[PDB]
Amino acid sequence: NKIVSHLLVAEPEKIYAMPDPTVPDSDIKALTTLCDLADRELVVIIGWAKHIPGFSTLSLADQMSLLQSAWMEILILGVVYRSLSFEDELVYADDYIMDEDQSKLAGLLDLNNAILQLVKKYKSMKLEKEEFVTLKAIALANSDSMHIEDVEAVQKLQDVLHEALQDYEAGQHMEDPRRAGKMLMTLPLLRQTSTKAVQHFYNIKLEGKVPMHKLFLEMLEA
Ligand SMILES: OCCC/C(=C(\c1ccc(O)cc1)c1ccc(C2CCN(C3CC3)CC2)cc1)c1ccccc1
């Protein structure tokens, strides 16, 4: 598959959390570590997205729209995938892994348990790298931004990625004629826990103890 193949190649290189053992552990250390990690990943996502066929020919405003609705889905799906071969831990990066006890120390228990629900589902499906990268692309195209101007063009991007996934499954998973549909039926859980995650920003902001960038605060309030 042309599209699956280029997506495999466009997969970004590992990113490291670079946590510092001289800062005493705390919910604040954990959360600001996750913020720096995520902003470096967001920068990688923009370069990555220009390898999605059709994405870079949308208007500036449409590209912003799609990415504004999908970035947390893309981030979480990466964490999900990196944890497939672990048990009840979330692999944020090779050097930043969270078990149940550290989730609680960070205030992220309920959120991380929701994510581990996704890990569990994809584990039993034996999710392949090929499927993960096409799912990531589909999460972007299917973001359901309310702002899109060129609805016809985004519908076409979803169809091209949808077609790539189905084609891949038709060839590599003939023992399951409905595997592509099973993959797509995990997307509602993905969007569910991105909304849970974005909503958590507001808890953190209200409590006021963890420092946030002033641009982020402005975005949150708006
Ligand atoms: O438990 C799972 C959720 C972890 C997590 C993550 C996270 C997810 C995946 C990943 O790979 C790395 C990190 C997170 C944290 C900070 C941001 C920032 C805010 C600041 N940025 C603006 C400056 C531009 C925008 C991004 C983005 C994501 C999170 C999310 C909400 C509350 C608390 C923790």
From Swiss-Prot:
Chief place of localization: nucleus
Tissue specificity annotation: Expressed in the heart, kidney, brain, lung, bone marrow, adrenal gland, trachea, spinal cord and thyroid gland.
Gene Ontology CC terms: chromatin; nucleoplasm; nucleus
Alphabetical UniProt keywords: Acetylation, Activator, DNA-binding, Isopeptide bond, Metal-binding, Nucleus, Phosphoprotein, Receptor, Transcription, Transcription regulation, Ubl conjugation, Zinc, Zinc-finger
Ranges of residues in domain NR LBD: 1-222
A GO molecular-function annotation: steroid binding
Post-translational modification summary for this protein: Acetylated by PCAF/KAT2 (in vitro).
GO biological process: positive regulation of cold-induced thermogenesis; positive regulation of transcription by RNA polymerase II; regulation of DNA-templated transcription; regulation of transcription by RNA polymerase II; retinoic acid receptor signaling pathway
Tagged with keyword DNA-binding: yes
Entry's localization field: Nucleus
Family: Belongs to the nuclear hormone receptor family. NR3 subfamily.
Role: Orphan receptor that acts as a transcription activator in the absence of bound ligand. Binds specifically to an estrogen response element and activates reporter genes controlled by estrogen response elements. Induces the expression of PERM1 in the skeletal muscle.
Subunit structure: Homodimer. Binds TLE1, PNRC1 and PNRC2. Binds GRIP1. Interacts with NRIP1, NCOA1 and NCOR2.
More info: No physiological activating ligand is known for this orphan receptor, but 4-hydroxytamoxifen and diethylstilbestrol act as inverse agonists and deactivate ESRRG.
The name this protein goes by in its record: Estrogen-related receptor gamma
Species of provenance: Homo sapiens
Record gene name: ESRRG
